[PDB]
Structure formats: structure tokens, C-alpha cells
């Protein structure tokens, strides 16, 4: 629908949906932009992280909460089957736009970082949904891993995007995977390198990473 | 388990 | 769309997008519901009256931020127009099914005070995003001072539709209509009236009117 | 102003 809309225009009223917490609006505007077919700023790369991220985050919750009731207990269930259609529809639109083609033109080391940690998460959530499930898991460690493995030649151990994406791969070890001690071992080893890079930021930078490193103790916390 | 937020 | 699922079930799925907070599902199903052509019983106008308030409450929140964002400075003023027009529908979907046919066929003084009252509530949303909007206005006082006259032959003072009635209307008059001396009298008499009645009350309908009385309390001390 | 939540 957003075709006839110049690309400035997308980003500017993806903007203005953040600030109104219209998410979905967000998200609509975000996707026109990237089929204008232009790579995308690191920015905006955070926009569309974010509004689909809020979109499919209020869909998971919804789904949690019906699933909750069908378990204790047809409309719990047709209805919980609706809300699963509509989030696997937004996790198809996301892993669309990565595939056609965000991925294959990430040039640089920290785009393409950033969208293959995004496929492992949207892999992830239908995961979460899944019964095949397990070819869903395998592409989603897959699009972990090889993240992983750019990340670690290519970015410090502070950078806020390598940290998000050890983080978001050790909850899918614990979460999805039933592989514990990956997590454990992963979130461990993850916040320790950081640690021992904090003395090379700047306070901006000491801001980013510490704020993730508090995630990944947080995480440990609840898991030992 | 709390994810990137 | 809803006209192939039963009644019953579209008030079990209504009470668990509740459930969810999936709040525009739930609108949807009750505006079936309301379809059906049967009248809506208490816990149904409760059902109703929940999921478009908050619908178009977080419409009315977004419209806030879009609007104060474009006086303070084309798309700003195009995306607060989107968000406007769709509040507009919402509100129109709305008294859409009050006329046809919900407040015709309200018999008991009850459920055409209820109704009468969401009338003028949807009039006063549509009258925040007016500029005509002095019709919409005059529209809003009549159906409030309808549902007043009914309430306070037919209803003890205490009543909670009747509070919340007057908690409105007297939102109405400071916010809308300009007349902040008419708001105070109102929530001053309504609050006293109810006061000197509390002593009727059970536990449970005590609970009901002192929460309401606390909510014309506040607006008084915001107001004075 | 706290309209009937
Ligand atoms: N509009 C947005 N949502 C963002 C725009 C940019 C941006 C803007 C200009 C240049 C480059 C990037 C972002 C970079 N992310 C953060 O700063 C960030 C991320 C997560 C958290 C959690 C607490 N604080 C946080 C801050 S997020
Ligand atoms: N190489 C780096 N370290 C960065 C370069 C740029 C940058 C690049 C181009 C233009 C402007 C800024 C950054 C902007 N911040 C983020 O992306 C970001 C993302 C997530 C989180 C979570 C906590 N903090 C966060 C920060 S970080
Ligand atoms: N599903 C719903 N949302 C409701 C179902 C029924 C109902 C159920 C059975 C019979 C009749 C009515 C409702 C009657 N309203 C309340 O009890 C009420 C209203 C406002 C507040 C604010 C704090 N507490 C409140 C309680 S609300
Ligand atoms: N005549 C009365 N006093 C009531 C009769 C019934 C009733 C009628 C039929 C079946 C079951 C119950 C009531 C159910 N409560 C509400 O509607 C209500 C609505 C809003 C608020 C806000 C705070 N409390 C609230 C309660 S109140
Ligand atoms: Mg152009
Ligand atoms: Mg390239
Ligand atoms: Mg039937
Ligand atoms: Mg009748």
C-alpha cells in the first residue's frame, strides 16, 4: 500500500508512530521502506527492529495468555489458532523482507549481523508456536551461529548488536532448544569478554554496553 | 527468560 | 464478517480478548454480538462499553501525541489526519449500532441510560478532533442531559452507571463544552447526593459507588 | 480530567 509513498516519507512517519506507540502503523511504514529497495542506515534498522519487535511481542503475550487457558480447560482454541495464524503471518512478512533482500545485500559486517540475528528471533517466535518444529529450531540456531561467527571476527565484545544477539541466542538455547547449559555457558561467557572491554568505551558506549551486560546477568540470575 | 528489548 | 459465528460464542471470544488485551478483536466481536438484533444484558454493555473505550482510547492517545507534535512545528499533519479519520470511524461504528438499534429497543430505564450515556461519550470523542463541532457538541449535551433526567427518576443516587454518567458529563462540560463552573456543580452535587445514600449500601455496592465518588473526588481537586 | 475508566 506504502508504494506511492516517497521513502523519506516512511521513515518520517515511522518515526512519528514510535513516539505515538502506533506499532502496527510502525511496522506497515517500516516495510514500505525497505521494499523501496535501498539498504538501510543503521537507524533504520533499529526502526524496523523495533516496530515488529512490538507488534510481535504483543501477539506472543496474547497467545501465551490463551494457550494458558486452553491447557486448564472449540473458541479458547479457534481462537488461539486465529491469534497463531496472525503471528505467524508477521513472522512470514519479517523473514520475506530479510530474504527479498536485506540479507544478500548486507554488505557490511554489522547489517549483515544485525538481520541474521532478526531471522534467528523470527524463526525463534514461530518456533514458540510450532508442533517441523524442528526444522524451525535448526534455521533459527543456523541464523544464530553464523552470526555468532561474523560477529566475533568482525565486532569488539562490547558492540551493542553482538551482545543483543549472544543474549537473544542463549534464551533460545535455554527457551526453545532444552539446552540449558548452552545458555548458561553462552550468556557466561558473553558478559565476561564485555567486562574485561569495558576500560576501551566511552561513557556513551559504557551506557550501551552495560545495559545489555545487566540482561544477560539478570538471565544467569533466574538460570542458576 | 528476559531478551533484547 | 462475524454474522457466520453464534452469539454465544462471540461473547465467549469477546471475554477472552479481554483476557488478552486484544482489545480491537474484542470490539469486533461484540459489534457481532450487537448484530445479532437481541438485546445486550448488563454484563454484555459492560463488555461492549470495555472494548471501545479502549480502542478508541488509544486512539485519542496517538491523535495527543501527533497533534502536539504538529504545533509545535506535510506528513505530521498527514499521519495525525490518518489516525483522525480512523478515530472518526470507530466513533461512527459506534453510534451506528446505538441507532440501529440498541437505544430503540432499550426498554428498562437501565440499558437506555447505559446507552444514552456511551452517546454521548462517543459525540465527546468525536468533538475533541472537530473544528460543526458545535453540532457534535449540542449532539453530546443532549444525549448526557437525556440519560441524566432518566437516571435520576429511575435510579438511585449511587448507582454506578448513574456516577459514571455524571463523571462524564461533567467531563463533558469542563473539557468540551467550556462551561467549568457547570462541571463543578455537577460533580459536586452528584458526589454529596451519593454520599448521604452510601449508608443503603452492601459491601459489594458500596465498593462500586466509592470508587467512582473517588474519581469525581480527583476531578474536583484538579478542578478547585 | 479523569473521565469513567
Ligand atoms: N528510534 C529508535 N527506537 C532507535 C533509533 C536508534 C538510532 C538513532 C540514530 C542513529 C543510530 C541508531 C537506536 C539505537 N538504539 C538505542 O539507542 C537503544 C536501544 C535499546 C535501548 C534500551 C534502552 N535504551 C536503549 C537505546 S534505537
Ligand atoms: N559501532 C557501534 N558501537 C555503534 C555505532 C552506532 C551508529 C551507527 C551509525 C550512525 C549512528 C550511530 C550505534 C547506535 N546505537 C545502536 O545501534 C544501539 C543498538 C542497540 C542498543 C542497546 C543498547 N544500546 C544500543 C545501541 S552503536
Ligand atoms: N468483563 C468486564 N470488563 C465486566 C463485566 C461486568 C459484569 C459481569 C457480570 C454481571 C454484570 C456485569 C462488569 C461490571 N463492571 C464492574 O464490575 C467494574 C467496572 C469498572 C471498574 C473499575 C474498577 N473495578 C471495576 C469494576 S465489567
Ligand atoms: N443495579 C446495580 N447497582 C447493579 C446491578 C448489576 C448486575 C445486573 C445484572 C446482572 C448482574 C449484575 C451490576 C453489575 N455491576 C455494574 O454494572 C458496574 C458497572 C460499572 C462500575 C464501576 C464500578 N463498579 C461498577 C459496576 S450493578
Ligand atoms: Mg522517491
Ligand atoms: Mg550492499
Ligand atoms: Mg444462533
Ligand atoms: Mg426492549
Redesign the pocket.
Known sequence: AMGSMERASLIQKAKLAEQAERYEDMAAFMKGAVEKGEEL???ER?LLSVAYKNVVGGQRAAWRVLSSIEQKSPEVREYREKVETELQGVCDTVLGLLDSHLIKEAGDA?SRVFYLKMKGDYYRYLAEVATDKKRIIDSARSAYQEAMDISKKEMPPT???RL?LALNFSVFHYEIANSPEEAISLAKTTFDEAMADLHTLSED?Y??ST??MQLLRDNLTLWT | SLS?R
Request: hydrophobic content about 20%; aromatic content about 0%; charged content about 35%.
Open positions: 542506515s543503521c537507524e533499529n554489522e558492540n551493542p548488536i543483543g558506549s551506557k550501551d545495559l545489555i | 533484547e
